[PDB]
């Protein structure tokens, strides 16, 4: 999204290390595998109106001209440089989408050198839900203890991420307790950023868990190349065994003679029996993002949901 | 020179809309009158879009010809239950610390009116008045707008008055005269308390040979809303056929406003103000003979409302969150008690 | 809920130029109180030379009009709160198709064309043989009528029939100059809405796609001339077979009111659109049938 | 008459995506009488599978030695019955007194019953994904495979809509990953609403087919019930597709409760008789390089529609 990209430029400007949190812990396993394929032809232009107000617009063949009016204010005086992929700082974000007047907001207030706070409201007029969450969190050098109070029903939560000890045998958890739904939830993660001498590469062995369902997962994610990257997730389940094996082959490039950069992607799934392809090519301001999805289950190979997506911005 | 950009409309009823606007400053060979053309595309309504050409050409140091070719489609009256489309041209000539300008236009427009509400939503937009306004019309209109704005700012002022006077003559069909006063006055040190008064009157005559050719629903006056008399729904005042606001042939609309700059000191010196207002007005159909019996109607039973609230006043927009209370109303007016959200540029 | 301190009577001031336009389009079905009335919204209204009554100019609107004078025991309006027949625009509905029915005043129900089509065909749905004939008129004879009024009649014979815009005598007043300019700008926009009524845009997707377009090239014109020619050859075979289906045994069936409403609207067209030239010359028993069917609805 | 009938099939028999080509093969195969042979003599069936040779995009076209295109099954049959020489077994020619009811029946299968078979070819998720969308790979050429059943499914949705059936993503994206238990049950509130909606669609279908076959069979008993008319061949070509699809056994049962089993098996005795008849009457043809719809010929046919 763009709410989850504004969040990452505030963190890298305040040096908060979002990669040690329990929302970027299985990061490579989802950016190479569960990317979005555009389902139609698409055009988009973004701009910037006031010093603290951005504007967007898009129209596809399906939907008409949409839009959004962003607001963004922050005391972080190196913010906008990391938008493009002690002082008690702050951030205020707010965005209304206007074919439909769907709101959203975000308030960050770094209350200490090692403690934050995060409001995240999403208040849609239609499909009505005033979700209003609060993410108190106390970072340290070995933790990211992070309490969440949502307002979907009354959903409270918890997270923790204890780093151990290249060999980084990390650990995580979460313990969610719906105060109205009475439906708990848990997890565990044992990721391991390592180093090897085959190509020069990390690994990501995400030995996940969910002890209520027995829903163990896995993940392997190599970096076989100086630019390319490969991943392979093996889903599983306990007491009701039903597997999967996904894939992903994000392949980079750089071109010169503004500089053209092209990032290829694949996603071979086996339980879904599909093959997702996508090419994402940038420029100074322009960005073309095409993508197809072949389904293998005569003529089995039927490319459902082709799409291209143009985007210019500034 | 080109500046293909994107913005936000801040239009009629609280609901902003995206536009995409390509400019082109024409070079000094098809020129010696410094001309820029525009092409602004907006979201139409569900079949069509809204294209809006412009061609501003500075004739004199104080003269600008605008040639505006529009093809715009938009939703309208209360439940977005009316679909309006407009095709035509507009040749407009604008003549120049107090802002003063006169602006004469000449517009030919073909207007399609569609009842786009569903027949399950049963008596709304399906009155005898709205059933007969659906159709197609062509309409040439001549105008003159005079604006004398002695205020120091347009959206967040602190002194001075404003006078806007409009005329519209569709020849042999209707003549439409509007006035809008405004008066902003401040009494404290750093413009802390700002007392703002507005008065809008209007009058519309049917010039069409013994009351043939009715005036269209899009040409009559409407009252109510966040950007008008607050504490009533938009299209919420005036006479009605069944449940549809059929507009008025004359109106008066006033309003007070006090602002207070939020006495919490860490949030002072900002664009937020503590807002208290008293709005009100009357919308009437005036038995189209005189100007004397029209004021006997226009000053009899007003639809007033008071309320407190909090307002942001930026140069690009004015956000208004009020708690309104209808003081008086008519028995069929649309009331909107409690919280009301306002957004736009012009409030009254 | 106590807060509006004074509340006044509703407001009783009306535009008397709106009530003069509604009175100019209303035709009153002669022969109950405020809520037991309907207003049949039609496209326009013509004047019959024989009976002098106000018939509607579209074959569907005239069918629903005669089916209301049969069901309710009315007499046709001539060109104490009786029912009504409004001349409306197509754009008075989201459907943009127009026979509609405006029932009631404060509890006002609107029946669209598709709602009236389900109502009108379910009253002879119990017969299966006459439902085949009713479906043949509504598909084969309807499609010849529409293609010969959208494409084969002039843009002033179309807007005479399918528009509530004003038929001026000639171009004398500057009001009459720009009334003639509307019938040029808004002719193809009214033709496009008429091709959406009986699912004509789905039986005829290609000659409807060529209407939403410019300059009318030779490929779309030599295909339309082939589609419109087999549409007319079929309808010559429809109308010639109907002449053995005109025997009256009393009150007219909903098929006899639909054969009559196509003949009464084909013979109103002032141009030789080839359905008029065929019905006048070869179907002279159909013209005589459609006048005998009509004269039990007049006085 | 002298012409060339274009169809949808693949080189020996008409395809099941079009009941108007199936019924027209049987119509030509069953002209065995002396009078019925005269209206069919020299018709030269072509299986071109390209709709650019049509006057309206539908592909039983009769392009008849002048450029006069007659399109669709019902228009061709009424054209061929009009062009007999004028001077009982396997295809009847109805008399003057029965020409109107036989056209009324032919038109009723075209507008009411063939609206239901194009539901079952494209708007049935069991039939469209298994059978239909993998049938155009056998008929058309290399770039034009994924637009023809996609446009034909959009056409059948518009044709059967009034009888049968950006913060929205970010709303759960702060909560559903943060709840992690109804991320598994985000699809479960969709297939829990998908389940009572497809049986909601199968009831307003199956009483439309219960009424369109009841109306047709009640008007068919006014003509001669012992002889084969050209309206019977379009009715049977609608059963032969509706029963022969992947979801045909649900419909062979549903028609057997209302109309019996002595009639659904009497209709399928005529149906399987008509498919297994010899093609000695059929004089076929191969398409030329103006009738194929190649990659180079469907761009020349793409520019002429705007020129």
Curated annotation (Swiss-Prot), chain C:
**Which N-terminal stretch is annotated as signal sequence?**
none
A single Pfam family it belongs to is SAM35
Q: What is its main location?
A: mitochondrion
Annotated Gene Ontology cellular components are: mitochondrial outer membrane; mitochondrion; SAM complex
Which InterPro entries does the UniProt record give?
A: SAM35
* Localization of this protein: Mitochondrion outer membrane
Q: Which GO terms describe its biological process?
A: mitochondrial outer membrane translocase complex assembly; protein import into mitochondrial matrix; protein insertion into mitochondrial outer membrane
Per the record's keyword annotation, is Transport included, yes or no? Answer: yes
Question: Quick check: keyword Membrane in the entry?
Answer: yes
Q: Please indicate which superkingdom the organism of origin belongs to.
A: Eukaryota
The UniProt keyword set, sorted, is:
Membrane, Mitochondrion, Mitochondrion outer membrane, Protein transport, Transport
Subunit description: Component of the mitochondrial outer membrane sorting assembly machinery (SAM or TOB) complex, which at least consists of SAM35, SAM37 and SAM50.
* The protein's role, per its UniProt record: Essential component of the mitochondrial outer membrane sorting assembly machinery (SAM or TOB) complex, which is required for the sorting of proteins with complicated topology, such as beta-barrel proteins, to the mitochondrial outer membrane after import by the TOM complex.
Q: What else is known?
A: Present with 1470 molecules/cell in log phase SD medium.
Q: What is this protein called?
A: Sorting assembly machinery 35 kDa subunit
Q: What is the lineage of its organism?
A: Eukaryota, Fungi, Dikarya, Ascomycota, Saccharomycotina
UniProtKB/Swiss-Prot annotation, chain D:
Q: Which UniProt keywords apply?
A: Membrane, Mitochondrion, Mitochondrion outer membrane, Protein transport, Transmembrane, Transmembrane helix, Transport
Per the UniProt entry, the disulfide pairs are none
Subcellular location per UniProt equals:
Mitochondrion outer membrane
A Gene Ontology biological process noted in the UniProt record is:
protein import into mitochondrial matrix
Entry's transmembrane regions: 16-32, 227-245
How does the record say this protein sits in the membrane? Multi-pass membrane protein
UniProt keyword Transport present: yes
Q: Which domain of life is it from?
A: Eukaryota
The cross-references to CDD domains, in alphabetical order and at most eight, read: GST_N_Metaxin1_like
Signal peptide range: none
Q: Which Gene Ontology terms of cellular component type are present?
A: cytoplasm; mitochondrial outer membrane; mitochondrion; SAM complex
Q: Which InterPro entries match?
A: Mito_Protein_Transport_Metaxin, Sam37/metaxin_N, Tom37_C
One Pfam entry for this protein is Tom37
What the protein does comes down to: Component of the mitochondrial outer membrane sorting assembly machinery (SAM or TOB) complex, which is required for the sorting of proteins with complicated topology, such as beta-barrel proteins, to the mitochondrial outer membrane after import by the TOM complex.
Relate the assembly described in the record.
Component of the mitochondrial outer membrane sorting assembly machinery (SAM or TOB) complex, which at least consists of SAM35, SAM37 and SAM50. SAM37 interacts with TOM70.
What else is noted?
Answer: Present with 1580 molecules/cell in log phase SD medium.
Supply the name of the protein. Sorting assembly machinery 37 kDa subunit
